[PDB]
């Protein structure tokens, strides 16, 4: 499967990509929202991991905009924000799931896997 990772922190972004690659997937890694639009349009990914703290455009704005254009793939959010209202808001904007920071990387892998399993 093809995974799009959108993550502003270079080190995290690279870690994500190599772990997901090592599990047998192809990964596009974008560092901001507009770059995310770049990968989205070039190859439709099967799944996207989106950090909300993008320097470009907030991740919620990004999810909203994709959904409102009938982009329907599963999206797993990475987020600093962790109140229960934040989580309702994120889900309500079109995300399928979220992981709160700080996180272990095996937690994102496990969430991504569960969406992949459902999706396919």
- Whichever of 29 and 74 has its CB closer to a copy of itself, that residue is 74
**Would you tell me the crossing angle of helices 33-42 and 59-68 to the nearest 10 degrees?**
30
Q: How far apart are CA 62 and CA 34, in angstroms?
A: 9
> Which C-beta is closer to a copy of itself: that of 10 or that of 88?
88
Where helices occur in 1-120 by DSSP H, the ranges are 10-22, 33-42, 59-68, 84-93, 105-119
Nearest approach in angstroms of CB 109 to a copy of itself is 8
Residues that bind a copy of itself (CB under 8 A): 74, 84-85, 87-88, 91-92, 95-97, 103-104, 106-107, 110-111, 113-115, 118-119
Q: In angstroms, what is the minimal distance from the CB of 90 to a copy of itself? A: 9
Distance, in Å, from the CA atom of 72 to the CA atom of 100, rounded to the nearest integer, reads 23
**Least CB distance to a copy of itself at residue 95 (A):** 7
Shortest Cβ distance from residue 118 to a copy of itself (Å)? 6
Residues in the chain: 120
């Amino acid at each position: 499967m093809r995974v799009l990772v959108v993550e502003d922190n270079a080190l995290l972004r690279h870690h994500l990509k190599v772990q997901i690659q090592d599990a047998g997937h192809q990964v596009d890694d974008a560092e901001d929202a507009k770059e995310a639009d770049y990968y989205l349009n070039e190859h439709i990914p099967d799944i996207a991991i989106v950090d909300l703290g993008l320097p470009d455009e907030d991740g919620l704005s990004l999810i909203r905009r994709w959904r409102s254009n009938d982009v329907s793939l599963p999206i797993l959010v990475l987020t600093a924000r962790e109140s229960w209202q934040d989580k309702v808001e994120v889900l309500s904007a079109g995300a399928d799931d979220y992981v709160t920071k700080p996180f272990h990387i095996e937690e994102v892998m496990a969430r991504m896997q569960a969406l992949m399993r459902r999706n396919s």
